Design a protein around this ligand. Structure first.
Ligand code: NAP
Ligand code: NAP
Ligand code: ASD
Ligand code: ASD
Lengths: 277, 277
């Protein structure tokens, strides 16, 4: 029997690279259900799949919108094996800008996709894993889920939310045989005018500085998606997986500083200087 | 000029005690706008206010539903002074139970009130604080926002979400003169049949154990609301407030263990043993 894997958010980035890495594995051990919110975006996945020569039947695409529990249930029903060995909750949205410049709908959407959509996947797929006493859940996390980043208030809110969701579930799942793990990613290679109308000139200037700083960190530290995707595989094959895997060690010093001063003052000062010099 | 304070969620608990502590201050330095989602619940606030003899005009109630940006805007307009010196984002919901037993609407509501509602308060009130270069924002946090608790997956999700929201905003607000702080609270003195239908017998049994453990921690460690409310006041009067204040030192050892093993394995094991013995 092959390992059945269901991944959300496979139109690009991590989810696309992980789906074709697993489907193309030389051992042919995995059957992958790559899900996408809109099947019109599946072309890059099929072009990457052909390039790694995934065997016929190793990869299938399903439409799955994690904002809708009916779409979640109908994709679950399309899993012909009647079981999901590995569930990868990767679907996600970013949101960048002055908090007061973000639309209310955009805010609600980031939380609904990143947080409620993961809850909807877990409600639909966990019960069967708990009953069989086996199953692996991998959740794409971010450094933004471990420490707060300026102008990413809502995005960070949603990634910190996943840390608390997963850690709470991990405490309960320990003796059930169901393993949950977050894969903590740094940056990965994957109008000024409207913002200026919704904020003050100083905040706008600080946003510019954040953006110039961010592009520089990205240019210097973004990892290839193949390297990040391999951390998922490592977590998948660990006999007793930990709650968190880190794709890089680059942000651990910032992490440790944050974690060693619970008042948060050292972190706030250090991150303001790191971003705004 | 009096310090104008606007507090959300004042029908009971922390928000009710803080509103009457501030309005009854012997110095008469504060004017409090105590807001409630449903004004039919304001009786306990007025009974507590009379008992502490808050002077006439020291305390006013406004209806404010943080799920609705129109209700947020109309309460802002009722602030006759045209300024809010201290904003207290305290409105919040709990959610307890097996993740698969929680209704989709209940999940969405906890996030919308606890997380999006705080975002809506900050969008409505921050810009004026940034323009004046002064203002204090206090957010009620929880130990459940710092570490994951079994059967509180969504509640923890929402409190961790506030940590990432506030920390992200704090990094930007540092030089603006606007101070944001989380007040980290432990427990504070403030049908089996439907759950059994939505989960397995083992999860149900574990829920019972969590509940018996929780009631015991509460009975032994719940703090009086007057003590918790005073930590808000302390943060309010600090000339250079920190990002986080802790109402107690009881959970710091668990916190430190969690923070010293980034893999999360020590935390998961220690919390499973603490709750389930
Ligand atoms: O780094 P990335 O590349 O941005 O990865 C994020 C993935 O999440 C997906 N996603 C966003 N909203 C989703 C939804 N509602 N349901 C399922 N997948 C979603 C994205 O699809 P899209 O980029 O097609 O939104 C994308 O495939
Ligand atoms: O500990 P607590 O006592 O439960 O405090 C939580 C406070 O948050 C309030 N709250 C819940 N939903 C709210 C909403 N949508 N808008 C404003 N306040 C809300 C609660 O009011 P209610 O208890 O009246 O919902 C209560 O006053
Ligand atoms: C937001 C971001 C860039 C875009 C991206 O794709 C992934 C990340 C995560 C790491 C962020 C970084 C931007 C700059 C940050 C604030 C730092 O100085 C340290 C943490 C780092
Ligand atoms: C959920 C809870 C009880 C009800 C309440 O009102 C506030 C809290 C926060 C502290 C929780 C506690 C329940 C039991 C927990 C899991 C522990 O063993 C350590 C942390 C503690």
């Amino acid at each position: 029997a092959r390992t059945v894997v269901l991944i959300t958010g496979c139109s690009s980035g991590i989810g696309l690279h992980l789906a074709v890495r697993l489907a193309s594995d030389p051992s042919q051990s995995f059957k992958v259900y790559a899900t996408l919110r809109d099947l019109k975006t599946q072309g890059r996945l099929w072009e990457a799949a052909r390039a790694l020569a995934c065997p016929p039947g190793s990869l299938e695409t399903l439409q799955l919108d994690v904002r809708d529990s009916k779409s979640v249930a109908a994709a679950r029903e399309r899993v012909t094996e009647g079981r999901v060995d590995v569930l990868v909750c990767n679907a996600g949205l970013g949101l960048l800008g002055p908090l007061e410049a973000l639309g209310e709908d955009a805010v609600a959407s980031v939380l609904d996709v990143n947080v409620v959509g993961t809850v909807r996947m877990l409600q639909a797929f966990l019960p069967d894993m708990k009953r069989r006493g086996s199953g692996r859940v991998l959740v794409t996390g971010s450094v933004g889920g471990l420490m707060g980043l300026p102008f990413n208030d809502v995005y960070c809110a949603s990634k910190f939310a996943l840390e608390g969701l997963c850690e709470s579930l991990a405490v309960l799942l320990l003796p059930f045989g169901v393993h949950l793990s977050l894969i903590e990613c740094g940056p990965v290679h994957t109008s000024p005018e409207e913002v200026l109308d919704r904020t003050d000139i100083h905040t706008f200037h600080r946003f510019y500085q954040y953006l110039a700083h961010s592009k520089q960190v990205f240019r210097e530290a973004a990892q290839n998606p193949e390297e990040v995707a391999e951390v998922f595989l490592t977590a998948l094959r660990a006999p007793k997986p930990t709650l968190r895997y880190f794709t890089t060690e680059r942000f651990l010093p910032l992490l440790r500083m944050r974690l060693d001063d619970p008042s948060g003052s050292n972190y706030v000062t250090a991150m303001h200087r790191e971003v705004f010099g």
